Every structure is written in structure tokens, then in C-alpha cells.
Amino acid sequence: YQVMKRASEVDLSTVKYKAETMKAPHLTGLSFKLFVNLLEAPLIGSLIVDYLKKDNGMTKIFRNTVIPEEPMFRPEFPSQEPEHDVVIVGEDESPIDRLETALKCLPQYDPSSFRYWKIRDYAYAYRSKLTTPLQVAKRIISIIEEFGYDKPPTPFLIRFDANEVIKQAEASTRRFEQGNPISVLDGIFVTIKDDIDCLPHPTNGGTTWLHEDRSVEKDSAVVSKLRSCGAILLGKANMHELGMGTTGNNSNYGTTRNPHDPKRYTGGSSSGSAAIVAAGLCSAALGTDGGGAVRIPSALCGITGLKTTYGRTDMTGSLCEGGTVEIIGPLASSLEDAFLVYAAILGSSSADRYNLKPSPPCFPKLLSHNGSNAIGSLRLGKYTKWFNDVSSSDISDKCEDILKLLSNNHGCKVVEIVVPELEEMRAAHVISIGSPTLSSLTPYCEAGKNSKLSYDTRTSFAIFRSFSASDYIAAQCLRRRLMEYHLNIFKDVDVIVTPTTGMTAPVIPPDALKNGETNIQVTTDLMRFVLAANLLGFPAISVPVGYDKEGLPIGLQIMGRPWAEATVLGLAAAVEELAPVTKKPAIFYDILN
């Protein structure tokens, strides 16, 4: 008749890892266009969705279960104990002044197996006049215009003004010529995801029409901070439409291709951001993360993806401002670059500063000795059955070796944990991320703009329109239950270590390049370890940790306490020291030559 719960009284020794996935068929092309038209049909549209939600256990959780907890509408973080061995940075400081402190937290720069270029490598080359930002911009523009990375069918960028990039590089070159560069980011090329505002480009979020209904008159908070440091905004990256996807498929501009294997997906939704950084075209990129959209493509393309704490970074000037799960984080080819870009874009909005009361941001002392005893004192939380729940055995073993290696060189202790109610976490997250997305686009869809969206988005919107208001309340009660679980886990361990994704980069079905696809079995394997950071606001970083049988990159996820970015950055720095990215992508471009 009904089920009952209680979260604070759950016996943790009786929690059982439920390992059934979300079953669904795999439709493509012509068989993908008609069934979407059935979902948009008046009568049978609701009947199909009501059956789908009733078969994957969503009606039982939402409408047949008495949840005793009160709704937690946004991540409510208690006061955290202060971190150990960090450098506190002022809450009211400029991005230039924070980069000066970040450089002090890095090991001494020593210009001495394949390796990506670092931001400090570009920065030293500019100051040694070995090259100039204008010359580096010409090389990038040449690599974009010859292979068509700003054009269909396989673009890194969907908005690119080469003449605008030259203007910034000319101003950056003149600053180095006069010997007064702005910061370490002066001349560094940063790509912006298409759901973040960056002048003079419009914002479409992967659509073809959003610029008509939503205009852009100023930069976003992150782009304004980057631009003030001297960074060169390259353009708007391709993405899965409106972030409603985890593969990167785009029926409008084409699917961005993985630099390791162009026949495979990059991961979503920051497809163009991760791919243009994995290919080495630019030093770093910015992307949004509502359901792993920063860490998922970072794992499948073999780069670093930092998902910061909710509210840590001002999202003003993006398509997901006002949401309860999304953040804006950096994507870079190394921990040092990811830590530098984070140092520039961080800072809460005025409203979030009051509503969330974040602790002053700190930086990790990446310079070990006198360090690496704080790393060894960290307790690593491992949910073994959750850890081993991967498609290929190579991923669980490659990440279990890092946990093994971290204990041999530093002394870290791996603690067996249990994360209860993972199925509830999926249900609570899908409705928490879809409801604000559909609400901010409903006036346009009602105006006839719904047809201009892709079939992959219209499939999600069809399911989103079936969510009632009472379902949202119940889901926020579940968000409190999972918050209490994770806050008690962080009373024992300091981080929760998992693989970032359950599978490596999947190949693109050729019938999916026509007008998208719908493969839940793949999107489920990709969002298995990332939802806890979005629903509960925790910071999570995806660090590469090697490759599998087919040489595809594997990433490890380090999820820490609220506002504990320095801990997840210092641990990932020790991880990448034991597992450096050594293989070169199939698609790669060596600028600075």
C-alpha cells in the first residue's frame, strides 16, 4: 500500500547496494523521430511517460512512499572544520591578486614520454620572448580554419570570430612588449562552453535559436574575471544541447570527436570544451556541471575536470543560473592548470554569499616537503561494490591501483564506506536539474520554439513535463536524506574515491549522427559516480589515472567536503604524480613551435 522511511535511523550495516540499471531501448534516426512525436501527442504522450516512470521505480519512490524528512531545496552545509595545510585567500580579492598567491603554492618552475603544455610554460615563453601571444593565436586559428573545428560536422567550436581573437592577442602582445603583463594568465587561451555568456558571442547552449529570445550584453562573471587577468577567450565550445545529455551528440552543429579516437564520443555535456583541451588547442576551458558535464568528458578525453562546491563560483551570465545542482568549473590538461584557472574564476555571487555562507577560499600547498604528511593523513572513502560496478574490469582495477599506490608512498588509509539510497539519488537529481531547465525555456517552447529543439532534448522535456509539483517536494526531502548520509560519511573519511565513469569513451553509432539518439544504458553508465556532487553541492575532481585495453583514458573521481577544493586538488596532485598522462591523443596539436 505504501512504504515508509527514516534516514537518521537507517542501520548502515543493513544497507545493500542495488545494482540494477535503467533499462530502455536504443532508438536512432527515423525510429527516433516518430517515437518523439508519440511523446508529444495529446493522449498517448502522457500514457507512455506514465508507464516509463512506473517501470523504473519512479512512481513508487515519488508517489507511493511516505518520506519523513523535510525538503532540502538547496545544499545546506553545516560549518566545516578548517582544512589542514592550506593557504587561506581573502573572500574579497581580485583574480589578479589570487593568481599571485596560487603561483606561490606551486613547486618551483623548472624548465627541463609525452607531456601536455602547462600554463606556466606558455607564461615563461611569453616573458622569454621565445614566442608572442599574437604568433600563438595565428597557429591556433590556422589549426581551426584548415580542419574546420569551428564548422560542421565535427567542430570544437560553434561560435568563433578569428578577427576577435587576433585583437586580444595583439593587446596581450603589446603588454609583454612593454614589460607589464597583467598576470600569469595573460595570453592564455581559454574556451567557453556555449551555455556561458562571453562577449561578443551570443549564447545558444547548443541550440540554433536561443540567441533570438535571450540576448547577451555583458560577459558572465567567470569570463569577466578571466578577461581581467589577460586571458584570451577563444570562442564558444560545442556542447550537448542545453546540457540535456552526457555523450556530446549535437543534431545541430555535429558531434565533437574524442581526440583519442574520433569515432568515439567525448562525453557530455561539455563536449567541445574537453575535446579542444584534450587535443591541446588551448590551455583550459570552462564548462557547466549539472550532472557530471565537467567530469564526464574530462574522464573520457583524459584531462582534469574540477567540479567546485555549489555557489563557490558565480554563475551569473549562464543558462543555469538559479539552479540547485549546476556549477561552472574549469577543464585543463593538468592539475596545475586546473588549479590556476579555478583561482581566477572563483567567488560567490552576492546572494549566494549570504544564503550559503561559504568559508574563505583556500589553495593547497602543492609544494610537498614540508608536505605530503597531510596527504598521508587523509582518509579515503571507498564503497567497494559501488567502486567495482563498472562495465570493463580495467577501470575498477586501474582506480584500485591508485588507492594502493597512495597508501604505499604517502600512507593514506582506505575506509570501507556505504552510500545508501543511490536509486533515490538518481530520482531526486533528474527532477532537480530538469525542472528549472524546462521552466526557463517554457515561454519559448509555448511560442512555437519547441520544434526547433533537438529530438534528444524534446525527449527529456517530454519526461520533465510529467513531473508534478508534489514530486519536486518529495525529491527535495530525499535530497536531505542523502545530505545526512554524506555528512556522516565525511565525519569518518575526508574524501570519497570512485571511478569517474563506469565506461570509457563509447563509439558513436552512425545512425545517431543524423538526429541524435536515446541510449539510456550508456547515459546510466556515465552518471553512476557524479550525481552526489550535483544534488548535494559537494566538490569533485576527475583526474586521469591511465588507460585500458584500447588505450582509452580512465579518470578517478575525488569528492571532498563542502568548500574543500584545496583538499581534492592536493590529493589529485599527488595522484597525477603517480599516474601522469603519458600517451598522446590521436588528434593533438603542438603549438609553441
UniProtKB/Swiss-Prot annotation:
From the UniProt record, list the reaction(s) this protein catalyses.
N-(5Z,8Z,11Z,14Z-eicosatetraenoyl)-ethanolamine + H2O = ethanolamine + (5Z,8Z,11Z,14Z)-eicosatetraenoate; N-(9Z,12Z-octadecadienoyl)-ethanolamine + H2O = ethanolamine + (9Z,12Z)-octadecadienoate; N-hexadecanoylethanolamine + H2O = ethanolamine + hexadecanoate; N-tetradecanoylethanolamine + H2O = tetradecanoate + ethanolamine
A GO cellular component annotation here is: plant-type vacuole
| Expressed in which tissues | Expressed in roots, leaves and flowers. Expressed in seedlings, flowers, roots, siliques, seeds and leaves.
E.C. code: 3.5.1.99
Q: Where in the cell is it found?
A: Endoplasmic reticulum membrane; Cell membrane
At which positions is substrate bound? 290-293
GO molecular function ontology, one term from the record: N-(long-chain-acyl)ethanolamine deacylase activity
* Superkingdom classification of source: Eukaryota
Q: What happens when the gene is disrupted?
A: No visible phenotype under normal growth conditions. Enhanced sensitivity to inhibition of seedling growth induced by exogenous N-acylethanolamine.
User: Known Pfam families for this protein?
Assistant: Amidase
Task: Name the active site residues.
Answer: 193, 269, 293
InterPro entries given for it?
Amidase, Amidase_CS, Amidase_dom, AS_sf
> Quick one: effect of changing residue 193 to A?
Loss of activity
Report keywords, A-Z: Cell membrane, Endoplasmic reticulum, Hydrolase, Lipid degradation, Lipid metabolism, Membrane
Q: How does it assemble?
A: Forms homodimers.
Q: Which PANTHER family match?
A: FATTY ACID AMIDE HYDROLASE, TRANSAMIDASE
Name under which the protein is recorded = Fatty acid amide hydrolase
Give the organism the record lists: Arabidopsis thaliana (Mouse-ear cress)
Gene for this chain: FAAH
